[PDB]
């Protein structure tokens, strides 16, 4: 006969990334279109990450939830080759989540929501005060660092600088060495692209899950149990998070 508040963490996007093949290979005039295909895959991932935010966002006191100490706590606790700025800025998504929180917050809503105790709710809110956000941020940071390290690697050539090889080796051998360097760099870029594809798929799954929650778990009632919340469902309280979404599911249990 008691209510509780459960915190759910769902990543919806990671750091934006893209490459410029005209500058990536050299700061062979044009090795091939393989790098162009890699850049196309990366910009497809970028568009997917820009769309995930629109999929999830913009789709008895409440001082802690309604502004936003929780949002600030998540902001400060959670921390070619150009990182593009996200299309939706932090304050865009903050305004969107605040507006949707205001929409879903409007003690008569408790009376109407019982069809499908202030101290218990206050205690559940207080006991709350981010692992997957750190996971994805650190993982993409390590991915970019590893890609830079592979860029610095000679990959069996005689140096890591194309201009140094041009000024140091004859053309009939400089072309072979540059071919080795560019093939190794494009192999590293292929590893980055495929890792970003699989991780983009895994973040798209979570973004679709979060969008479903933001459509039914926060709007109206989640008639389906165990989806969001430990038991029967009353309402959810979304919270903007850096490269993620935080839900505060208010559940009712016997």
């Amino acid at each position, epitope marked *: 006969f008691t209510i509780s508040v459960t915190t759910e963490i769902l990543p919806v996007s990671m750091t934006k990334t893209s490459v410029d093949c005209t500058m990536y290979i050299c700061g062979l005039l044009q090795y091939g279109s*393989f790098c162009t295909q890699l850049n196309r895959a990366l910009t497809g991932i970028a568009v997917e990450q820009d769309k995930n935010t629109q999929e999830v966002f913009a789709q008895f006191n409440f001082s802690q939830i309604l502004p936003s100490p929780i949002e600030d706590l998540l902001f400060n606790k959670v921390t070619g080759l150009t990182v593009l700025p996200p299309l939706l800025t932090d304050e865009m998504i903050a305004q969107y989540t605040s507006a949707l929180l205001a929409c879903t917050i409007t003690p008569m809503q408790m009376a109407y929501r019982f069809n499908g105790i202030a101290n218990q709710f206050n205690s559940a809110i207080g006991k709350i005060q981010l692992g997957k956000l750190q996971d994805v941020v650190n993982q993409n940071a390590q991915a970019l660092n590893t890609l830079v390290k592979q860029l610095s690697s*000679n*990959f*069996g050539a*005689i140096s890591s600088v194309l201009n140094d090889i041009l000024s*140091r*080796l*004859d053309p*009939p*051998e400089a072309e*072979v060495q540059i071919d080795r360097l560019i*093939t*190794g760099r*494009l*192999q590293s870029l*292929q*590893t980055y692209v495929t890792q970003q594809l699989i991780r983009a798929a895994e973040i798209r799954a979570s973004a679709n899950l979060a969008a479903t929650k933001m459509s039914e778990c926060v709007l109206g009632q989640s008639k389906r149990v165990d989806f969001c919340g430990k038991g029967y469902h009353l309402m959810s309280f979304p919270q903007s998070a850096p490269h993620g979404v935080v839900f505060l599911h208010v559940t009712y249990v016997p």
Partner: antibody, heavy 117, light 112 residues
């Protein structure tokens, strides 16, 4: 037809520079990279590093701070100077002509060098 | 640093039969984009300089008879001496030229 012949002292004193000069007969010396592969007795071949007539050079990482190689086009030769020769450097040396993709084409009749007395 | 291993060692094969030598690499020795194996096979005769038998682990050099056939995929590499004769007695080894340092094989001596 490219032939490589080694020359140098068969006995080198410990902690003294080991100089081995490989002379190339036939073909040309300003054509490919030149390595100085080494085989210790009863051990697999060890790649010491490949030079170049332009002055370009790439040592083995394990021996980068002690190996030095110099290619002279005027005399059509290339020489290996191994410094700080310890007791474990006793081995046979093959001067090789590594091609553009850096696989050995001609190996050359290596010379055995040992440290004693 | 790539560790290159010759699992078959001291192959005592008679005349008219086949000897197989396997070279195993610690990691891949071929670029994923090109799928071109950066491995070579050499043979060394006693009191004689070694000779280049195979480069790219598939392509054959000049003067190599049809007896020797090389292949492989990624890490495993196979050299088969079809119809081995007395001329094939030597120490065969594998070389990688993918990334420095360029470690050779331990050397497998094929005895009659």
């Amino acid at each position: 037809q490219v032939q490589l012949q080694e020359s140098g002292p068969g006995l080198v004193k410990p902690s003294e520079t080991l100089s081995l000069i490989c002379t190339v007969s036939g073909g040309s010396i300003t054509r490919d990279f030149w390595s100085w592969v080494r085989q210790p007795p009863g051990k697999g071949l060890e790649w010491i590093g490949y030079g170049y007539y332009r002055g370009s050079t790439n040592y083995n990482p394990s021996l980068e701070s002690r190996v030095t190689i110099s290619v002279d086009t005027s005399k059509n030769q290339f020489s290996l100077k191994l410094t700080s020769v310890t007791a474990a450097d006793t081995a046979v040396y093959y001067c090789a002509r590594e091609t553009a993709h850096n696989w050995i084409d001609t190996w050359g009749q290596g010379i055995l060098v040992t440290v004693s007395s | 640093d790539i560790v290159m291993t010759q699992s078959p060692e001291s192959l005592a094969l008679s005349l008219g039969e086949r000897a197989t030598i396997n070279c195993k690499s610690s990691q891949t020795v071929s670029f994923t984009s090109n799928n071109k194996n950066y491995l070579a096979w050499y043979q060394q005769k006693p009191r004689q300089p070694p000779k280049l038998l195979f480069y790219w682990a598939s392509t054959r050099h000049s003067g190599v008879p049809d007896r020797f056939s090389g292949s492989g995929s990624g890490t495993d590499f196979t050299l088969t001496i079809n119809s081995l004769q007395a001329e094939d007695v030597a120490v065969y080894f594998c070389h990688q030229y993918f990334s420095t340092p360029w470690t050779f094989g331990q050397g497998t001596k094929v005895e009659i």
